[PDB]
Structures are given as structure tokens and as C-alpha cells.
Amino acid sequence: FLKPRLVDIEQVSSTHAKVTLEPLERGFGHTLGNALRRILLSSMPGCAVTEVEIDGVLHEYSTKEGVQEDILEILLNLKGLAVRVQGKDEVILTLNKSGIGPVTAADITHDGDVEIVKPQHVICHLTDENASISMRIKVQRGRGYVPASTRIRPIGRLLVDACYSPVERIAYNVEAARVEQRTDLDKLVIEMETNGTIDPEEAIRRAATILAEQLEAFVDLE
Amino acid sequence: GVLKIVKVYLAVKRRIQPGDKMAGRHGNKGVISKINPIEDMPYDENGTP
Known part of the structure; x- marks a missing residue:
């Protein structure tokens, strides 16, 4: 049995990448592709936003004066904010902005361990230059989808839904690969669509590590 | 017979779940059966479920 090795991590965009596997025996390509997908x-692992506090507002069904968008819409916009923390599993982000103009994610005060993948993301629009907005964004590390109802204190804190999932579209194809002279060798390429927080090769490595760890359940160590 | 009247407005945010009724426009009503995980749904060639 030939051992698959990762040869290309070719990226066509910041959020789109294709990872190819050159050597594969017949029948293994589809199995590995489906299991990996x-x-x-x-x-x-993801780093979605969990909490948000705004000084003016109390409950997320209110409206802030001077802000074009509703508070619920602001929370929904924040839910899609993609951010990666490379040093901590918890961080507090502060956003301060004043004057007329859209409030983009680039306006968030940033630390060394926190970076924004797409600064062009918009949070809310300020229509009156007198009005100002301030937030305390709380970002946690997790996996899967954790609804805001299943959390298990102050009035000011606003709870948002948490969906820690860097990947959102995975597709794979199995193609014939020519190695030396023998045929039946298959090449598996996996096309990924992340939000930019997680590297492709690291994602494949983590997924395969989890798959190998789970295989040890019904087999002795090998 | 009453001194003061107090009205309290609660605002509960519903979410879809099995048992809810969902319907199209051409009279094809139905009830939600299972919230299938994202990976279990059928996907086309490009990978969109």
C-alpha cells in the first residue's frame, strides 16, 4: 500500500484553497475524501464572537440614537465577524468610533495576538457626527455550533449566537495520477472554503489527527 | 376597583425546531422532521449542500 503524501497547498484566494494528495491506491481516494470532508x-476549532456589550443600550431589541442600523442587526453583523487569536482562547475587543461614516471592523482596537482577516467587514453606520458608539467584544475558542440559549449576569451584556466553524464548503475529486509506470494510482484534491481564520494544510492535519485518534477506539495501538 | 395598572412586555425569540409547520406557496404544507447536520445533507459536484 502506497502512503499518501501532501504535495500542493495551492491557494487561488485568501479564502479559497485546494489541497492535493498525489499517491493513493484504488478505492482509498473516495474513502479518504469523504471521511476528511x-x-x-x-x-x-474556531474563534467566533460570543459576547457584546454596548454602553448606551440595555437589551438587543432597542435602537441607539444616531446609528443607522438596529441593535439586533448590529449583533447579526457582529456574528459573522471572522477573527483568529493565535495566543489565547479568550480575548476582549474594544471598538470606538465617532463621526459620520460606516463603522468597519478595521476600527476595532487590536492586540498582537488578535488579527482581522477582512477589515472591509462593516458593523454599523453612523449617520450623525455628534453620535458615538462603543463596544466590548468578547471572543472565545470553540468548535461546532453553540446556541445562545444553552450557555449554563448584568443587564447590559448582550448574548449572540456562537458558530465556531472556519470551513463552510468542502469539495473533493479523485483523479488518475501517473507515478512511475504502475497504474490505478489516484490523486485526491480537496477544495476548501474558509473564512480565513484557519490555514488549509493545518486544517487537513488536524482533521486527519482527529480521524486517527478516533480509529484507536476499536483497534489496538498501531 | 383598581389603583394602578402595570403592563409588562416580554419579547421571546423563537427558533425553528422539529414539529414546526413550514409551507410553500402551492399548498404543500409540511412539518419539520429532523434538523440534519450540515455534513449529512446531500451535496452537488461543487460541494454545496
């Missing part, structure tokens, strides 16, 4: 779409 399921284990990537299922469980990957």
Missing part, C-alpha cells in the same frame, strides 16, 4: 465540516 465529514470530519472537516463537522468539527474544527
Whole structure:
């Protein structure tokens, strides 16, 4: 049995990448592709936002004066914010902005361990230059989808839904690969669509590590 | 017969779940059966479930 090795991590965009596997025996390509796709779409580490506090507002059904968008819409916009923390599993982000103009994610005060993948993301629009907005964004590390109802104190804190999942679209194809003279060798290429927080090769490595760890359940160590 | 009247407005945010009724426009009503995981749904060639 030939051992698959990762040869290309070719990226066509910041959020789109294709990872190819050159050597594969017949029948192994589809098995590995399906298992990898399921284990990537299922469980990957993410860094979605969990909490948000705004000084003016009390409950997320209110409206802030001077802000174009509703507070619920602001929370929904924040839910899609993609951010990666490379040093901590918890961080507090502060956003301060004043004057007329859209409030983009680039306006968030940033630390060394926190970076924004797409600064062009917009949070809310300020229509009156007198009005100002301030937030305390709380970011946690997790996996899967954790609804805001299943958390298990102050009035000011606003709870948002948490969906820690860097990947959102995985597709794979099995193609014939020519190695030396023998045929039946298959090449598996996996096309990924992340939000930019998780590297492709690291994602494949983590997914395969989880798959190998789970295989030890019904087999002795090998 | 009453001194003061107090009205309290609660605002509960519903979410879809099995048992809810969902319907199209051409009279094809139905009830939600299972919230299938994202990876279990059928996907086309490009990988979109």
C-alpha cells in the first residue's frame, strides 16, 4: 500500500484553497475524501464572537440614537465577524468610533495576538457626527455550533449566537495520477472554503489527527 | 376597583425546531422532521449542500 503524501497547498484566494494528495491506491481516494470532508465540516476549532456589550443600550431589541442600523442587526453583523487569536482562547475587543461614516471592523482596537482577516467587514453606520458608539467584544475558542440559549449576569451584556466553524464548503475529486509506470494510482484534491481564520494544510492535519485518534477506539495501538 | 395598572412586555425569540409547520406557496404544507447536520445533507459536484 502506497502512503499518501501532501504535495500542493495551492491557494487561488485568501479564502479559497485546494489541497492535493498525489499517491493513493484504488478505492482509498473516495474513502479518504469523504471521511476528511465529514470530519472537516463537522468539527474544527474556531474563534467566533460570543459576547457584546454596548454602553448606551440595555437589551438587543432597542435602537441607539444616531446609528443607522438596529441593535439586533448590529449583533447579526457582529456574528459573522471572522477573527483568529493565535495566543489565547479568550480575548476582549474594544471598538470606538465617532463621526459620520460606516463603522468597519478595521476600527476595532487590536492586540498582537488578535488579527482581522477582512477589515472591509462593516458593523454599523453612523449617520450623525455628534453620535458615538462603543463596544466590548468578547471572543472565545470553540468548535461546532453553540446556541445562545444553552450557555449554563448584568443587564447590559448582550448574548449572540456562537458558530465556531472556519470551513463552510468542502469539495473533493479523485483523479488518475501517473507515478512511475504502475497504474490505478489516484490523486485526491480537496477544495476548501474558509473564512480565513484557519490555514488549509493545518486544517487537513488536524482533521486527519482527529480521524486517527478516533480509529484507536476499536483497534489496538498501531 | 383598581389603583394602578402595570403592563409588562416580554419579547421571546423563537427558533425553528422539529414539529414546526413550514409551507410553500402551492399548498404543500409540511412539518419539520429532523434538523440534519450540515455534513449529512446531500451535496452537488461543487460541494454545496
